[PDB]
Amino acid sequence: QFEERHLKFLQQLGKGNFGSVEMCRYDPLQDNTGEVVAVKKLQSTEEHLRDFEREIEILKSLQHDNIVKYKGVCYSNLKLIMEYLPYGSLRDYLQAHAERIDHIKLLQYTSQICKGMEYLGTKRYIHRDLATRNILVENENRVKIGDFGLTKVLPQDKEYYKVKEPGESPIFWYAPESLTESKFSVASDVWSFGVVLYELFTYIEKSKSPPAEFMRMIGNDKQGQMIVFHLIELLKNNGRLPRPDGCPDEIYMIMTECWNNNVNQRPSFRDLALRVDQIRDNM
Numbered sequence: 616q617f618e619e620r621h622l623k624f625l626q627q628l629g630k631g632n633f634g635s636v637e638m639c640r641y642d643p644l645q646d647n648t649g650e651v652v653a654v655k656k657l658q659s660t661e662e663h664l665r666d667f668e669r670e671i672e673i674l675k676s677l678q679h680d681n682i683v684k685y686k687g688v689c690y691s692n693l694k695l696i697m698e699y700l701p702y703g704s705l706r707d708y709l710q711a712h713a714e715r716i717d718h719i720k721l722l723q724y725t726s727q728i729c730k731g732m733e734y735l736g737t738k739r740y741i742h743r744d745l746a747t748r749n750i751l752v753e754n755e756n757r758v759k760i761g762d763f764g765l766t767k768v769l770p771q772d773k774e775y776y777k778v779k780e781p782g783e784s785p786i787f788w789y790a791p792e793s794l795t796e797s798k799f800s801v802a803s804d805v806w807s808f809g810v811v812l813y814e815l816f817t818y819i820e821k822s823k824s825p826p827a828e829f830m831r832m833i834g835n836d837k838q839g840q841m842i843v844f845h846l847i848e849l850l851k852n853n854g855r856l857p858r859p860d861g862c863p864d865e866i867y868m869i870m871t872e873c874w875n876n877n878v879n880q881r882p883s884f885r886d887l888a889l890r891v892d893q894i895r896d897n898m
């Protein structure tokens with residue numbers, strides 16, 4: 616329902632899981648007016664096309680404040696049309712404005728990521744790619760989960776979805792049962808949320824990121840697909856990301872409790888939202 620000839624290229628925004636996202640002016644009157652939007656397209660196999668159409672449907676089915684807004688599609692090679700958010704990714708915003716973002720603000724974002732995820736759960740959706748690079752900023756007070764490219768629907772009958780053909784993955788955000796048995800759940804999204812909260816309290820220092828930090832603990836000399844093996848074994852032996860500099864005990868406990876080897880012990884997003892809110896209301 617969006618006409619290709621009316622989408623005017625302004626600039627690239629970045630590359631996602633498969634395809635890429637552009638900033639365009641939608642100008643169907645062909646005057647000067649018309650909103651700016653974000654346009655996703657594939658760089659395109661059949662397997663990817665199937666997934667992209669699933670992604671569109673997932674995004675269409677979501678209405679939440681903490682989820683990026685679907686606007687429409689563009690047929691002629693599919694295009695997904697979304698709201699454009701001018702502050703960009705949380706990782707970029709945080710790096711740009713690090714000096715005016717205090718711990719309270721960080722827990723406000725944390726709280727909003729929890730709400731959006733709690734909402735994902737009610738629809739039995741598994742995000743699988745929770746990371747600050749995937750969170751967008753709407754304004755200094757509101758963030759939105761974007762990129763639903765790897766998101767899966769739980770079948771009506773099972774509490775986990777096994778992912779056939781695991782391509783090159785965000786391995787440092789993955790729960791152990793995801794790395795071993797390709798098993799994805801509300802519990803694995805909770806683990807990843809734990810890494811997101813870790814990212815926030817490091818303020819995305821380069822050397823403090825989850826990849827830099829696990830490679831430290833494995834050894835920079837280790838290589839290839841050995842990396843994944845050493846990571847699985849490290850996690851089995853209760854090796855964990857360190858407490859970020861300036862991160863209080865109470866906050867670290869949320870992270871370590873999210874990073875439980877036992878799937879059933881990991882807290883719920885309902886618990887995480889409430890717990891975060893109180894620590895926030897404790898300052």
Ligand SMILES: NC(=O)c1cnc2[nH]ccc2c1N[C@@H]1[C@@H]2C[C@@H]3C[C@H]1C[C@@](O)(C3)C2
Nearest residue numbers: 628629630636653697698699700703761762
């Ligand atoms: N609504 C959007 O998709 C969107 C809106 N405004 C934006 N401003 C900068 C990126 C961006 C958007 N998507 C970006 C795209 C996909 C994914 C999430 C974003 C950052 C990323 O690195 C990874 C590239």
